[PDB]
Subunit: 231 residues, 2 copies
C-alpha cells in the first residue's frame, strides 16, 4: 500500500529478470513485463513470491503503442501506484553493414528501442509527476556501450538507437527534475576487449539499475553509468 | 569535377551548403522534399554564377523516394563524391508527456532512418568494395544532441544523438573502403559569442569536412555553436 512499485519492461529473462528479483529483494512490488512468453514471466513471478516478494506478470510488446497504454493500465489496476520504471525491453539484430540494411529493419530497431522507451517513460511521468498529483519517482533506461562504440559492421542501427536513449535520458531528466522524477541510464557492455577479462552478469547490471532507482541516488539525475568492466 | 548531393537543400543551412559547394568547384544536387520553387531559385543562382546544379525531388522520410534521388545524380553527373545529410524536421515545443506516437515516429523516420538510408545509397556508390573511388559524407546533427532540448523537443534531441553515433559507427565501418563520415552540430542559427550563427558558417564547416583537407578526419563531430 505504502510499498513502492516498479514496472520492468522485458522482465522475463537476462538483465530484466535480474532487476525484477533484486527489486523485490529490496522491498519493491514488481510489474514483470513480458512480450511473448507468459511461462517465463510466471517463473520470475514465482521466484519472487516464493521468496516473500510481490510481483505480477504484465503482458505487452513495447514496439506496440496500444500495448504500452494497456501495460500501464494493468499496473494501475494491480497496484494502485507507480514509483519506478526500468526501460529494459529492447532488441538487437543480426550483423549487417549499413549498406545492406532494409528500411524495415531500421524502422523496427527505432520503434522498439527508442519510441517504446519514450512512450513508457511518458506513461510513467504522467503518473509520478508532482504536477499531476503524483509523489515523484525514478526511471532508469537501458542503453548500451554500443552507443559509445558504434557497432561498426554489426548493427550501427542498434548503436544509434541506444545513443538516442542516452540523450533522451539527459533531456527528459532536465525536463522533469523539478517535478520530483529522476531519470538516468546504464550502458551495459558484454553481459552473459574488456579490461576486467570477463563478461558481466545480469545481476551486476541489476545492482547498478537498482542503485539509480533508489533513494541513495537522490541527487543523481540525467546521469549515464557504464556497466562494462572498463570497456 | 566532384559531385555532392545535399538533402533538404532548398533553404537555410542546406541552401548555404549548395551555394558554397558550387563556389568551391563542386557540381551540386539540390534536393527538395515538397514544393520545388525555393530549390529552383538556389539552382538558378548557382547556374547564373557559372556553377552546375540540378534540383532533385524526394522526401527522405519516404524510403520509396530515396533510390530515385540518387539515380538522378548518377544520370546527371555520372559520379558521387559527397553527401550532406541535411534534411530534417523539428516539431512544435512540447513536453515528452504530451507527445503523440505519430510525432515521435515521424521525427525518427525523417531525421534518423532518412539519413541512414541516404548514407547507404552513397556508400553503395563510393565504396572501393564496389569499384567506387571513395568519398565523404557529412551528417547534420545539432547541439540538441548534447543539451537535450528539455521542454521543447527531447525527441528531436534524441534523433540527433542517434545521428552522432550513426556517424561514429558508419565511419568505423567504411574507413578501410575510402569513405569518410563526419557530422556537424549547429547551435542557434539565423551563446558565448553573443550572436546566432549564419547558415554560411555551418556550410563552411561542412565543406571543410567534405574536402581533402580533412583526409584523416573521420568519425568526428564538429560543434558549430559559438561556444554553446
Amino acid at each position: 500500500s505504502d510499498t513502492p512499485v516498479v514496472l520492468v519492461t522485458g522482465g522475463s529473462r537476462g538483465i530484466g529478470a535480474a532487476v525484477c528479483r533484486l527489486a523485490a529483494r529490496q522491498g519493491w512490488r514488481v510489474g514483470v513485463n513480458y512480450a511473448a512468453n507468459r511461462e517465463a514471466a510466471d517463473a520470475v513471478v514465482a521466484a519472487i513470491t516464493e521468496s516473500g516478494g510481490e510481483a505480477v506478470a504484465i503482458p505487452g510488446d513495447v514496439g506496440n503503442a496500444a500495448d504500452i497504454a494497456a501495460m500501464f493500465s494493468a499496473v494501475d489496476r494491480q497496484f494502485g501506484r507507480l514509483d519506478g520504471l526500468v526501460n529494459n525491453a529492447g532488441i538487437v539484430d543480426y550483423p549487417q553493414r549499413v549498406d545492406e540494411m532494409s528500411v524495415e529493419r531500421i524502422e523496427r530497431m527505432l520503434r522498439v528501442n527508442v519510441t517504446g522507451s519514450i512512450l513508457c517513460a511518458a506513461e510513467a511521468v504522467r503518473r509520478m509527476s508532482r504536477l499531476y498529483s503524483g509523489q515523484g519517482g525514478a526511471i532508469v533506461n537501458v542503453s548500451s556501450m554500443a552507443a559509445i562504440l558504434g557497432s561498426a559492421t554489426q548493427y550501427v542501427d542498434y548503436a544509434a538507437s541506444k545513443a538516442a536513449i542516452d540523450t533522451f535520458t539527459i533531456g527528459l531528466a532536465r525536463e522533469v527534475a523539478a517535478e520530483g522524477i529522476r531519470v538516468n541510464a546504464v550502458r551495459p557492455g558484454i553481459i552473459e576487449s574488456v579490461p576486467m577479462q570477463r563478461a558481466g552478469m545480469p545481476e551486476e547490471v541489476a545492482d547498478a539499475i537498482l542503485y539509480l532507482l533508489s533513494p541513495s541516488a537522490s541527487y543523481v539525475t540525467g546521469s549515464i553509468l557504464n556497466v562494462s568492466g572498463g570497456r
